[PDB]
């Protein structure tokens, strides 16, 4: 057996303030992916998060 | 994110650690119900139930056995 | 003091429903609007009525 | 609509598989009972009704024996 | 509304698992009762029973077992 | 008038107001069972009912007393 | 990916003993009920009728002693 | 004024208010049969009276014993 | 080698008493399985595990008995 | 305050997976691809497919 994979991610957070005020942004999402053979009906995910 | 604790912690190493068996018990019921008398399928549902009530089992006194080595300690702060 | 309470309502509700399966060369299975398995002798479907 | 389980599956299995012994014995009962006395007819007809008696208890022996092995695999789950 | 339980969900697999086995076997008692002698309706009825019984066995068993799953969990809150 | 309800009350109105009919239902199949004892579809449905009648009840209970032993256990510290 | 315990273990520990048995009575049932009457064929069967009956049996007796030990050490940790 | 019952004396008296006659047919189909032991129309009619009466007596029981149990959990908690 | 209790000393007086056991039980059933059907076979299996049951719970009424004479004695040090 | 959500992904997969084992004349079993062998007398081997 012989395998290979690539994989690539980009990110960008965007935040407004003024000057000397301390500011803070906060996120995460979760991601589903359908498994097969559909009749066995699930589901996977992962929560991406950033602070 | 959300906050989780220690006795969370504790408890989630079991789910983790038996990886399948929730869906397992479930479809080795559906497969069951459908033909109510098949020898496999009564044998494999027995193994699998049996399991299922020795991990709901094992987990919850753990976790209290926890909680009462936590509450023992606090009662000495006063 | 006086207290008054009045309440007038119509409803009606009217229609069918339909769902059913067919298996064909005991080799392709066929199903309308079922969320479940099929036995496979085929050839039947069901209308729901209400009125 | 026409549901069959596991035993039914077994006693239809013995059903189909004597393909048409069923109205072989009702022809030839017809046949012997309108001219009794035949030596031709009373030697097939014995042959006939004869194996129709093995298949019938055949069949049901043999379900009474799954019959009670899945009772005791049952048993079990408690 | 129909309000139902985590028991009743488990009893209700079996219900629609056996699509049609409660009226079935009704029927074959129907028409066996009118001429007992006919072993094609005896052969019959015999399966139907059977699964019968081995249908609402296993069905009352699997509901015991998951009270005591819970029974057990519920008394560690304490 | 109307009741006053404490906090200990709320918490076991949300497992009255959680199983809407059960407590009904109940007496209803007791009432058809115990009419033909010897009817095993009505002898299982009976058994489910019973079983999360008991449930429902045993868990409202054990709760409601976890939480007033914490009330309990902050109050001591006034003094 | 499949999941299995110490109870799984135990049960398949019998599958993979008894290589084949499972098909040869499928099979044996198969040739038996297209002649019941030949005494070769009901003396075939009725061998391996008992070796399943008392594998089946075996299996499901000893998965309930085990789960019968675990359930009363678990039992020790509250 | 009838004497005092509580909710398991209900509970019970509601099975003999189920089985209207019961009671009475056990004890007539056993005196006609003991009557003449060898007819089979009269075995055939006390096996399934007695039948039904064991299968009423048993369910009854079993019931009036959850109920103290329900009870006994939640009276066990006031302290 | 790795710091070991008194309550440990205690489990493990019961391992090393039954030396070969927890071995012994496992090559039983290797055997019983390849042929299910042998009473000599059977016959020595019902002894061991027998065995085996009592030995484990011996040991886990044990364990807990001293669990609670310490925890008995460390209330009063306050 | 307008608040706006946009998303889009694409997802494919494609081709067949190959494995098994065969018992060969009571003399050798022979197995491809099974992380531990399931050793099935007789033989089959699979091919499982996805699109």
Redesign the interface.
């Known amino acids: 057996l012989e395998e290979k994979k690539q994989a690539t991610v980009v990110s960008r957070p965007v935040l407004l303030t003024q000057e000397n005020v301390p500011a803070i942004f ?1 996120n ?1 999402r979760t991601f589903y992916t359908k498994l097969i053979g559909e009749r ?1 009906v ?1 589901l996977e995910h992962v ?1 991406y ?1 950033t602070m | ?1 959300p906050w989780s604790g220690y006795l969370d912690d504790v408890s989630a190493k079991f789910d983790t650690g ?4 929730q ?2 018990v479930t ?1 080795a ?2 497969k ?9 399928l ?2 494999a549902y ?2 699998k ?6 991990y ?3 987990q ?6 926890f909680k009462d080595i936590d509450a023992a300690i606090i009662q000495n702060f006063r | 003091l006086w207290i008054v309470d009045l309440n007038k309502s119509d409803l009606e509700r009217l229609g069918t429903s339909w769902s059913g399966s067919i298996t064909i060369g005991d080799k392709l299975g066929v199903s309308l609007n079922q969320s479940s ?1 099929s036995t496979l002798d085929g050839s039947r479907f069901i209308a729901a009525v209400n009125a």
Do not use: C, F, H, M
């Open positions: 906060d995460n066995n699930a929560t998060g | 994110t038996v990886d399948n068996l869906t397992q479809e019921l559906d069951l119900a459908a033909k109510p008398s098949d020898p496999a009564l044998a027995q193994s139930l049996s399991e299922y009530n020795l709901r089992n094992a919850s006194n753990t976790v209290k056995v | 398995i």
